[PDB]
Design a protein around this ligand. Structure first.
Ligand SMILES: [Zn+2]
Length: 46
């Protein structure tokens, strides 16, 4: 089947890239960052 995670709690703000939901905008505003771009990785596995 194609069931999904039963999310609980409605949020006023919701991302536009993924569609997430944050109680406080500030929180989301910082989330969108992941959609814009973020450099974390670096060293190659070995
Ligand atoms: Zn998002």
């Amino acid at each position: 089947g194609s069931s999904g995670s039963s999310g609980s709690g409605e949020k006023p703000y919701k991302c536009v890239e993924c569609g997430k939901g944050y109680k406080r905008r500030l929180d989301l505003d910082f989330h969108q960052r992941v959609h814009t771009g973020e450099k974390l990785s670096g060293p190659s596995s070995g």
